[PDB]
Ligand binder design. Sequence first.
Ligand SMILES: Nc1ncnc2c1ncn2[C@@H]1O[C@H](COP(=O)(O)OP(=O)(O)O)[C@@H](O)[C@H]1O
Lengths: 577, 459, 43
Amino acid sequence: MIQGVIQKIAGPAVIAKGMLGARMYDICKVGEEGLVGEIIRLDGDTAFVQVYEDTSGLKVGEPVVSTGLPLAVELGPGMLNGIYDGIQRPLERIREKTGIYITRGVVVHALDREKKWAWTPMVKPGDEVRGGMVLGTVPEFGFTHKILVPPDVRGRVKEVKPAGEYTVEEPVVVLEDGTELKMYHTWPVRRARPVQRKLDPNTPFLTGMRILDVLFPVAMGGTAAIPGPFGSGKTVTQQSLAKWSNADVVVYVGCGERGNEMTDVLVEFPELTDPKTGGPLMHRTVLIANTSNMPVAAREASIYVGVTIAEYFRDQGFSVALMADSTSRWAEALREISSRLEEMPAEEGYPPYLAARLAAFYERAGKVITLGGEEGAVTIVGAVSPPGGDMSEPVTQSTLRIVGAFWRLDASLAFRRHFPAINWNGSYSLFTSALDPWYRENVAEDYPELRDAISELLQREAGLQEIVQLVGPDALQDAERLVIEVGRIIREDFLQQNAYHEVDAYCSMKKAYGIMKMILAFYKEAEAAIKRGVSIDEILQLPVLERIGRARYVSEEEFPAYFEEAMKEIQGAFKAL
Amino acid sequence: KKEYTGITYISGPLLFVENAKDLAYGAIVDIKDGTGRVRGGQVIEVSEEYAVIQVFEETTGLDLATTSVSLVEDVARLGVSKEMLGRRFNGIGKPIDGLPPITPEKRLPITGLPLNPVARRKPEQFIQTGISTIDVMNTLVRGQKLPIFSGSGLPANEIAAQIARQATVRPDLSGEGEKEEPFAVVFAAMGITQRELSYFIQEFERTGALSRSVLFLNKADDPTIERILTPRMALTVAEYLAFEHDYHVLVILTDMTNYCEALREIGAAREEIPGRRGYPGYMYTDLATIYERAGVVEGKKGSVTQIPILSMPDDDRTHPIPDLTGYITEGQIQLSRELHRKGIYPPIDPLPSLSRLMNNGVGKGKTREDHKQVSDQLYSAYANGVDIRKLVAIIGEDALTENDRRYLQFADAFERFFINQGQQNRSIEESLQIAWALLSMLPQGELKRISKDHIGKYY
Amino acid sequence: IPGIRAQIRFIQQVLEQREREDTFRLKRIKGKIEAREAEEEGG
Ligand SMILES: Nc1ncnc2c1ncn2[C@@H]1O[C@H](COP(=O)(O)OP(=O)(O)O)[C@@H](O)[C@H]1O
């Protein structure tokens, strides 16, 4: 439409001249080959294209052609069980099309255009249809993938296709005004799919880990952040949330991760069994890989692509679970683009619009009742990587004040090989007061009281540990040493979890509540006996110590009897003496 | 060709030229001056008015009247071959030797072309080193990058030479072809002084491992942008000899701090928004670009594994260089000055040095069914001993419980027998026997990490 | 207590030292931006 030539190619960004009338964020195709970029400037008659490729080898004088369309995606059947690039290019197809490398200038569609799908009519010629309504259904492997009307569209259905087998190009509905509806449609990523109204979260997001389920919960609309230095497990924990959650779909965005860290998922997940239907686990994953040597603007591109896909599935009706890895890489991409724009930077170089982008990205997550009268959910768990571990970086601070839970990882706990390394006094949760009705309904009746007792005991033992480190853990009284030792038993038998065991990798709510009950009963009887006068060394040599210690390596079938036996054994053995 | 005369600015590294738009961005040039001596360059930020060069050697004697710049190649590319498997190069790639240049077989770029995340495979094979603090607690597998966070006067070159000499795979412990696999070193050094270079060369010549290794040398009396160029050449040659001829290479990159210094210097002379404490913003991008070139593909059988030596400047793990390196690689080994004081060797601090690709390369059916469990237990016991050290320093050694003394003595025996090993080649089984001997010094039933079966079988 | 106070004083001095370098580089960047935009009337 609007054609101009290159003038000042330098680094990852060019400057095209002779371009008057180009909008402010459309996608241009620079170079003699096509190196799709993006416009962020308008100075008189030039532009400032931002390339998504290598740019090594171009010249001055090669043409640039605008498109006038702001980076759409393709939404429809065919997305599940597949990898993508930063701008939605199928990695499998690029592989079989060029080789083992990723060259520049490859053109491949996002959704397949050859496979047949099982259409199923759901309308009647003459009805009234509005945006977000239902039109049909297409069976993907395990799900009844619906199809929808693109928003801001209406009319009068004139003639639908009967059942059969088509590609994603045959228009299955033809409205009266002439608009034809395919089985897919495009959506610009920087917008937000509209809804009717946003509900209040009232059900937890079970994830398997005893700490992040019992102590610091997250509702099914929430947000979180796992910041910590390198060598803590901001990836092991996210992979465990991706393979042992309670969601329906999962989107795993990697924004500057390791190639090995992303290929150890493509290899293993089509072997495990999702815990809701029995099929493979790779039939609910849409992971979006963008490693650390690919181009630099594809980082922000990948973040927005991931969020828009998750919102599409929420509008469909499932319960998605986004997982953004290392949002700090996004910030450093913005820093580089700012240093190329040659602007005035805020603290530490980060441009003066960081927090706005982060808030707009964290504020499209939550349970909602979409335009079809259903329910969906987009949960987000975004890792954060401080540049020295300090929680004073602008990203580490701006990512507070906007989130729900906050799971601060500690380095020393990760040197001791005490995993997971969740610091139990720097973290917090804000959802733990709206979920109590659900707990009372589906786990126990005094589970809130047990949780309160556990938290109170931990965060009272801390104060005594101060005096311990001052004087020494022998000048203390007997009740004080008992509190210290109960705290240590808790810390090593209820807040520890090895993601590589066979049965200690998915602990459910009843099992956690059982262990808490055992610990509380033991502490109560030991308090009584210490009042009586027996010695703390005998109280510790009581073998119920090792019983309730190893009570976590059990499976989940014989626990309802194991727990009863150990409970009665404690009640007996602590009045025998 | 002698075209493109009319430069108009010279200051330090940079050099500007008047109207020249046919020089492609990122090209290569060569700057002849008024006496015949030819230098090298590289085009940055081409534009319709001028074009900025980046001289390699130096800018002495260059006047503004008799000085030209000619085009050589539109992209940087190294002429690789298989005949360069006994040779010795320098910086850009001229042969510092008594033999003529090579006849190339293919000329590929030196910049990039990353690997496709779907043309990889999980590194699984297990390569032992004979250093019982790396074979047993920080396993090193074939296909992983693992730096060595050295120090000022700490022995890191010796550990690198020892690993290169002792490293061998163990095929008869998981089932494979018995004898097939030697190594192929691609030693690449940027900034080394004379003493260290002479040590490395003596050592490589003693073991006969010199006729199967290529050498790129950038000693300290040479320019700095050559330091910026060297590791890309090294990794290009390595990727070639691996993914084309089924070799198993082991790239030793020495002193990444000098590379980061050259980077900071060009960035400063470019005035490019310092990121954090000097060093520019894109240093994560650059270090990643030259680290992620080491993996394993499917279909082929080659492999590329790295050991980037780097000296944390002031003994700070929070310095940008070690920080970004730790974020990018997968694992690390960290020496200890305190242990170097007390004559230990190798002074590898075992707490802060981990390896990520270990849970997949060790375990039942690969080395022994009790490896990771002994690892976990040794870590826990050593942490307890280290804490009781401070308890002592607060209270006194005679006011201690009866088992705190057991933990203290375990810590001292651990530092005296398991870490200190001289220059001897251990084995996985000898080191596990030593580990079990030590772990037997503590009582039974106080090891909540190992299973009762292994507990009964070994003690 | 005096050793801890000395440590605090040293850390505080270094942290404040590493802000004036930033202010200086920012002022130089502003000078360069003014010198450049003073020539960007048209072209
Ligand atoms: N839940 C866990 N159980 C056991 N080991 C863990 C757990 N989480 C992390 N680890 C260990 O900690 C290391 C952290 O790996 P990774 O997640 O890649 O780094 P980071 O935590 O810094 O992102 C891994 O090598 C793993 O061995």
